[PDB]
Amino acid sequence: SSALLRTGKQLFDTSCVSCHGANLQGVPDHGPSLIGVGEAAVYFQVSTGRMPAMRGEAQAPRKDPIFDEAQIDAIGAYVQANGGGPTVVRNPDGSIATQSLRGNDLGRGGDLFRLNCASCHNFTGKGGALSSGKYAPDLAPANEQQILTAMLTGPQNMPKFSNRQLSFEAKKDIIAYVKVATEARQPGGYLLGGFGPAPEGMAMWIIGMVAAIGLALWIGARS
Amino acid sequence: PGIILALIGLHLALVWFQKHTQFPGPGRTEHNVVGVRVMPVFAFKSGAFFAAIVG
Amino acid sequence: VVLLITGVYLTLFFDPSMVDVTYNGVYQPLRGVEMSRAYQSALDISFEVRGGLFVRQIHHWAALMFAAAIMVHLARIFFTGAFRRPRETNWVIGSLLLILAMFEGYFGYS
Amino acid sequence: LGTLVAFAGGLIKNPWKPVVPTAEGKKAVLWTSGWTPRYQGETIYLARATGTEDGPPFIKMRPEDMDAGGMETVFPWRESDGDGTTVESHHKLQEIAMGIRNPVMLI
Amino acid sequence: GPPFIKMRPEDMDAGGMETVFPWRESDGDGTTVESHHKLQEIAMGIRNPVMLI
Numbered sequence A: 001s002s003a004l005l006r007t008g009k010q011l012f013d014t015s016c017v018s019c020h021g022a023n024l025q026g027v028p029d030h031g032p033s034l035i036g037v038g039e040a041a042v043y044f045q046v047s048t049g050r051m052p053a054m055r056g057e058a059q060a061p062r063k064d065p066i067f068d069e070a071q072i073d074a075i076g077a078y079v080q081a082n083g084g085g086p087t088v089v090r091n092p093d094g095s096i097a098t099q100s101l102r103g104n105d106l107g108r109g110g111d112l113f114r115l116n117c118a119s120c121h122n123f124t125g126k127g128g129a130l131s132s133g134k135y136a137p138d139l140a141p142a143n144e145q146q147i148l149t150a151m152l153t154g155p156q157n158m159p160k161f162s163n164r165q166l167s168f169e170a171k172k173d174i175i176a177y178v179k180v181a182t183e184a185r186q187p188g189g190y191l192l193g194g195f196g197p198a199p200e201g202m203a204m205w206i207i208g209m210v211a212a213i214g215l216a217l218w219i220g221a222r223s
Numbered sequence B: 001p002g003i004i005l006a007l008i009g010l011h012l013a014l015v016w017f018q019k020h021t022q023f024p025g026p027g028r029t030e031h032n033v034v035g036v037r038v039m040p041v042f043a044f045k046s047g048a049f050f051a052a053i054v055g
Numbered sequence C: 001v002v003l004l005i006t007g008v009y010l011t012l013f014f015d016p017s018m019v020d021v022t023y024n025g026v027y028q029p030l031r032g033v034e035m036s037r038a039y040q041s042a043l044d045i046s047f048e049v050r051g052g053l054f055v056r057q058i059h060h061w062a063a064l065m066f067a068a069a070i071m072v073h074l075a076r077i078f079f080t081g082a083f084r085r086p087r088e089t090n091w092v093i094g095s096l097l098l099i100l101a102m103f104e105g106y107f108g109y110s
Numbered sequence D: 001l002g003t004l005v006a007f008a009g010g011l012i013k014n015p016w017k018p019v020v021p022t023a024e025g026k027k028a029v030l031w032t033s034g035w036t037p038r039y040q041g042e043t044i045y046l047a048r049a050t051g052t053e054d055g056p057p058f059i060k061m062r063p064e065d066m067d068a069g070g071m072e073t074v075f076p077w078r079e080s081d082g083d084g085t086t087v088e089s090h091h092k093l094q095e096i097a098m099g100i101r102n103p104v105m106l107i
Numbered sequence E: 001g002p003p004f005i006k007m008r009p010e011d012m013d014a015g016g017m018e019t020v021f022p023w024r025e026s027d028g029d030g031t032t033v034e035s036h037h038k039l040q041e042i043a044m045g046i047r048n049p050v051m052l053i
């Protein structure tokens, strides 16, 4: 029943037309056109919850999603029927794919991540701050298809990596590196957040120095 | 490390031969040092502090 | 003192070169990557010597405690007024020690 | 005086001696870049890094390999460098990859 | 190309001596970096050299 996007253009009309237009034309006040975009953009924007957005400012944050029970497919197909944007990857069942996109190679994936991705996020995918509000979020709770569609559609202020400058193996290997870097142990004790020497200096000053000064107060008399 | 070791030696020598300062109190003057002798007590406290810091 | 001991231990495994090699070690997410010889020696200390990661972590924590204790000691000396007539030179020696400790820690973690 | 001068005289180097061969003679290191032409009209491609070492660590680029919101880092290629098979070309490429004035952003 | 080449029995007279090394043709000449590493490890082995009399 693929000839059914009457749902789709049933939810868009009651949740989007106030900021994108009835014909997906980009109300000149708030929203962009949404014509050249495809199913991948809608999937990434709605499944992560950044969509339907309230006031709208420097960065729409990630929230709880509103739509599922196969209506993300409905809106995605309805938007794809009005343009030629990229599409979401599918497995031989028709559902959205996963662990087969784990670039069996983590060295190349990590080198590509450090060259292309680590500048804004982190060494290991923690957050990073951009200018005047905007920031780069954490990469821990995003699944594989969300990572692929994120670097494929190029969301707000994030560059757009096509399938010609970043082939599909490159994307799969980057996905594998991200999912491994977010799920590995810390083989040295409790890591203090993923950042550099700021949590380390704080932990020194607030644990080791208070222990030392407390023992100095206990041993030596006060006068 | 060599320069730091030499300077630390000189620092501790100067502190040893110019006796330590002290806070004003009951029996304290500008001409005496009130405290505990090295012999039983001070070496003991210093070594215990060393072990606690290493811990 | 702890810094001296742990550094003497560490010098038995470190190789300070800048020539390029390919890793080919035990840490898998870095196999095939081209790196210097110092970075490879540090990785070998971390992953292939029984108790090496523990020792270099002690070294770094001891460096941090060294710096913090020096700063607290300077604060005491300044606020209680223990730098007056007989002890200005001892104050000067302490200041030099502080500068040297800063730069030594910098050269160390680089 | 003589002893101290002889002690501290082996470390001192001149930063402006011409040692880098270019198309107008030889220049100082601090003014050449690796993007500098060598024989008056040589072709220097904008190669991109692939992260793999079978044959290409650097490959040429076409204008259509990028969309209107993309960025990419590129390096000078000089096809006379070849892929990283032999030791000679491997040295050339590893010296291209480590040059503090080589990288370029393509917008 | 060759740091190591095969030998024939006629490449020596009745009063000659020669040092030889294990070849293993799967090592190849010293062109690529892989074969260059293999050969430089053959050349430095404390039990490899042999006298041919």
Ligand SMILES: CC(C)=CCC/C(C)=C/CC/C(C)=C\CC/C(C)=C/CC/C(C)=C/CC/C(C)=C/CC/C(C)=C/CC/C(C)=C/CC/C(C)=C/CC1=C(C)C(=O)c2ccccc2C1=O
Pocket: A198, A201, A202, A205, A206, A209, C071, C072, C074, C075, C078
């Ligand atoms: C007291 C002294 C500084 C006076 C010097 C006299 C002055 C006229 C000389 C000229 C100096 C010049 C003109 C300006 C100095 C400013 C600066 C550029 C100096 C560079 C180095 C300087 C001399 C070091 C001195 C700094 C000072 C003495 C630190 C002592 C702090 C106090 C006494 C600690 C008491 C106990 C402590 C508070 C336990 C609680 C822990 C708290 C939270 C510590 C706060 C804290 C600190 C202090 C961190 O450094 C830090 C670093 C990274 C992450 C977090 C933290 C952090 O939370």
Ligand SMILES: CC(C)=CCC/C(C)=C\CC/C(C)=C\CC/C(C)=C/CC/C(C)=C/CC/C(C)=C\CC/C(C)=C/CC/C(C)=C\CC/C(C)=C/CC1=C(C)C(=O)c2ccccc2C1=O
Pocket: B012, B013, B015, B016, B020, B046, C001, C005, C008
């Ligand atoms: C004799 C022998 C060495 C020859 C070797 C023979 C040879 C053939 C063998 C060759 C083998 C070689 C290669 C190696 C041999 C040795 C090697 C294994 C050593 C390498 C590193 C090794 C692991 C080190 C082990 C040693 C370690 C376990 C002991 C460390 C404990 C020591 C150093 C603590 C001393 C503390 C300090 C230096 C003393 C200072 C004086 C004391 C602390 C007073 C300080 C002090 C003063 C001075 C005040 O004025 C004051 C005023 C007011 C309040 C407080 C104080 C105060 O605390």
Ligand code: HEC
Pocket: A011, A012, A015, A016, A018, A019, A020, A030, A031, A032, A034, A037, A041, A042, A045, A046, A051, A052, A053, A054, A056, A060, A075, A153, A154, A155, A156
């Ligand atoms: C006016 C409030 C508002 C509502 C309601 C809203 N959007 Fe958006 N939308 C925006 C804004 C503003 C952007 C610009 C992207 C940004 O800056 O983050 C955007 C961006 C998008 C994009 C990506 C555009 C691009 O070029 O990549 C898609 C896809 C999208 N919206 C679809 C939807 C969907 C699906 C819904 C749910 C029916 C929805 N919009 C509801 C405001 C809204």
Ligand code: HEC
Pocket: A048, A050, A059, A060, A061, A062, A113, A116, A117, A118, A119, A120, A121, A130, A134, A135, A136, A137, A138, A139, A140, A141, A142, A146, A147, A150, A151, A155, A156, A157, A158, A159, A161, A174
């Ligand atoms: C600083 C520029 C920048 C670069 C370069 C960049 N990112 Fe992003 N990234 C962002 C920003 C800004 C967002 C937030 C977009 C939004 O919220 O709509 C984001 C969002 C994401 C998200 C969504 C995170 C989540 O929890 O939903 C993922 C996944 C992601 N990026 C992956 C990547 C990967 C992989 C690369 C390397 C190919 C990369 N990014 C490079 C800035 C960047």
Ligand code: HEM
Pocket: B001, B004, C003, C004, C007, C008, C010, C011, C014, C042, C045, C056, C057, C059, C060, C063, C066, C101, C104, C105, C108, C109, C110
């Ligand atoms: C005296 C003050 C000293 C300070 C403040 C200091 C500080 C440091 C720090 C912070 C590191 C980084 C370690 C890491 O991140 O793993 C380091 C590395 C190192 N230190 Fe020190 N250090 C000191 C003395 C010494 C001494 C005396 C020695 C040897 C005799 C030494 C030997 C080394 C070596 C070999 C390394 C590199 C090994 C490695 O990085 O794993 N240090 N130093």
